[model samples]
Target: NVLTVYSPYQSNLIRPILNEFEKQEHVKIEIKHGSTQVLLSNLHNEDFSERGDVFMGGVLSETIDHPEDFVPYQDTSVTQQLEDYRSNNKYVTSFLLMPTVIVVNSDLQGDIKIRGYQDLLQPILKGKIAYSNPNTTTTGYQHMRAIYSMHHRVSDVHQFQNHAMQLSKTSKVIEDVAKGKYYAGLSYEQDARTWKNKGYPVSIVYPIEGTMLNVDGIALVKNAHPHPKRKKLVQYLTSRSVQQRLVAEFDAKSIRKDVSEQSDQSIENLKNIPLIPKSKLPDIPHHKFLEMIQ
Candidate 1:
């Protein structure tokens, strides 16, 4: 059997896994790649939905908004996930987590105690922190929502944008922070762990208020012709063996507790600041968000 996959993950990151799964399951696979936002929008297009059988990589927070676009799948392994990381009513199977964190340069940090969003406004650090444009990057969007949830005011975000040096992408933020071109950056836990482990003079700081957990997941496309291999694909992605490989190869935080590596940085140990319910969040569109900040 052949399966159609809609994915946002880079080819390098996902191709090897797909190759391994195809050989193991004795099936052929075809993947179409695009940004998660664009791919999610395509779910509403009939041409896209009719052929797309699975969503291989997307965040739970965004996917939860459109549960109607996906169908539910049941697998014992899904129940093995940590309680907080469980599937959204079985519609979206939790895959991995990338919590929002501050990556600080230990040597350049000096006396400034960088702890959270508010601390980014410090005078000495003005134009020294690397931040991405929310309109273009995932980390930027997550960081915007995270700090916005904390203060509940527009002025607070304006204050932060003024102090931060806006970068174009998350990789630039990570690379600049590590090279000491910037004093700190708003980054995910995966990048933080990798950089710290690579001997960069950086420390991962989970905000004192609460950390925003960015959960990535997979789902079965809604209304697609049922295929016997669909469940197998979902189960394969979320399986214990593959979850462990994800951590070892990608530096990802596993959704399942048993396979997850335990450390201070682990999801179980972090204080997760629940995102403001979607209904309550302001209706500022991305273009408006860009306008408001500028």
Candidate 2:
């Protein structure tokens, strides 16, 4: 049977459950794993003759970009359970919402404080702060949107861009920040939480001003070969039981409000912090931003 192609992040989060599904449903599953941005970019201009039956990942925006490529599955069972913003007329369903935060190596820079978005632009942090390239990663793109939204001035844009350029001088944001190579970095809260859990001297700073929350989603391919098994798989993923399991096992934040809150302690701590509403994110062309950085 042709199972959907899942992203690396989702695959890692759902691997155990997938194995369970195979045993319970008597079906074989296949996963084509990679970053969501890479997958979407490849499919944007190329024919995905060998692509899977469904696409499930953190890059929900990708589905918006290529809606014609996905077949809408109206799963009403879970529709009522999800938040209104998560279910867009059942075309594509968002499962998780994760916020991006600024992570810092407290051991290396204990005195440096990050209270808001503006604090990141301080002269002391000019070369120490790091962020990923928006052109290549979703978190990177989200960070740019968050910063631009925070400071809506041309001078602010130039300053933020300069800071980004300095940060990229070392390497990718996540790697540099985790290794203490950069004093601070912009990345997903989950990534930062993982590092802190592993006892890295990392500390997450959710900007008081606000941050972006990414809605991870799932959708069937437009040209998918639908079968009984395929339908069952989709049902299983959107099922409340499966959603609860995902949150419990993978530390994923579920879109369902009734499943009992998962211990997203890191996210909960920053609950008071304002978040940039998804609707307000302006589509600053990533290519132009990249050219400016170069």
Candidate 3:
């Protein structure tokens, strides 16, 4: 039986799980990987044709962008336990919640202080800070939204545009940050943790102003190709048992409130980190910003 899955997380995280699933279920699992925006666009354009059976690892915004293409799948048993911020739908279910953080190279600036959003704009940090293209990445977009909202609160719109321009010419923000080519970068906390575990000299700082919590979710296509194995795969992904395993083995913080990370930090610590609320996000159409950067 054919079981296809779409993911934006690194394959290293998915491959082992898929292998285990295949061994247990005796079925093949095929995965298609890409940046969140690319995968979302593909699903939007293709619907379910020639697409994976499950859509996974993207920002909640994609659901907002193409709600009609998704079929809601709520796991009622776990729904009551979730925080009010999470969506409750049978067709689309959130799995993990991650925060976008500023990863800094401790080796380069041991004592330098970065207090908040405005700190990045200090003259000392010019040409030293990097960020992914907000127009192209969901994490990037969230960071931009946070910064812009912060500036807007103070009636400082130009700062947002200027800061974006400053960071645009750097290498992919996360890569450069990890290599110490840039003093800091805006990326997921998980990415920072992965890099540190791999021996990179980096430290993740959940921004003092609050960081965006990106809730990664799974969804079924509104009209997926008929495959007997599809339902089982979706159920497996959203199941409490599977979510607990993922959190324990993969360091992912599952959306299932019953599943908590082994770490001492509460999810509340993440929420308090500086970020723009989702409601305050501006309409900075992605394509136009990308064109400007190009």
Candidate 4:
């Protein structure tokens, strides 16, 4: 039997792992790539001619609302995962921990000492900080959540917003920061690492108060083809070994235990805030936060 994956992850990031799984499981794998929202719509609506066995790319915060669209397949062994990073529901099996971070343009941040979200409010950094639009971007909303968690007052969050330079998208946050047009950009760990590896004068800072560990999960599409290989792919994707592979090659933090620290930093070293299970979120819901900010 064949396995199909509908994902937003780039082909390069997923190909090698799928290749390995293909050889090991002796199953032919097919991937249909598109935006996470588009693929989720297709999977939810059953729009495709053939069934997609796995839906592998939506972030847990955004996708947790639709448990009915995915099969629930939980393993007790997943208890080995960090408490905050583990999925509260069996339908969504979280595998990656994408922590929010500040990417500082080293050349411009001289003596700025921006260690956390609080630092972004410094008058000296005003208008030099590029943040995405919370209404339009996931990173934007997450960054706002991070700020609210730190300050505990929406007024303080708004205070910081006044000093901020808002951008339309995340890519612009990375590009403008790398070009030194902005002193810092609110971004994820992977984006920071990727830009740093390309020789950009950027440094990553995980907020000292604690940062949001945005989770990425893999789910079995509901009513998928009746193939045993379906669960295999989910288990394979969330397995410790593959989690380690994602950490090494994909610049993502592993949700599984026993994965050693990397050159950049380890989960234990950073002050990560709660994310999964939804209940741990701030008292202000995302939509409410958006309204208050507006």
lDDT, each prediction: 0.73, 0.66, 0.66, 0.73
CA lDDT, candidate 3, residue 252: 72
The TM-score leader among the candidates is 2
Q: What lDDT tens digits, residue by residue, belong to model 3 across residues 1-294?
A: 778787777776668777877887888988887667667777778745676677777665343466777666654444533674465444566767777777778888777887656677777777677776565467776666666555444233346446533344212566677887878777776677677777887777776765667777777666557556766776676677777887776567677777755443322344455655666665555554344333
Off by over 4 Å in 2: 8-11, 45-48, 61-63, 165-172, 224-228, 278-294
Give me the overall lDDT of model 4.
Answer: 0.73
Per-residue accuracy of model 4 over 204-264 as CA lDDT, tens digit each: 8777766776777777776635567877877887788887888777666777886754545
Error of 2 at 170 (Å): 14
Predicted structure 4, TM vs. truth? 0.78
Kindly report which residue stretches of model 3 are placed more than 4 angstroms away from their true locations once superposed.
61-64, 77-81, 88-91, 151-161, 164-171, 264-294
lDDT for residue 132 in candidate 1, whole number 0-100: 74
Task: Output the worst ten-in-a-row residue range by lDDT, candidate 2.
Answer: 164-173
Candidate 3 is scored at a TM of 0.82
lDDT tens digits, residue span 1-294, model 1: 678888766575678888898999888888987656566766656553366788876564453446677777656687688887676557777788767788899988988898788787888899999887676556777688777766566777778888898877666777799889999999877667667777898887777655667777788887647567878888888888988887777656788978856454433344343434444456565556656656
Clashes of each: 0, 1, 14, 0
Better of 1 and 2 by lDDT: 1
Q: Against the hidden true structure, what lDDT does model 2 obtain?
A: 0.66
The TM-score ranking, best first, is 2, 3, 4, 1
Q: RMSD in angstroms, all models?
A: 4.6, 3.6, 3.9, 3.9
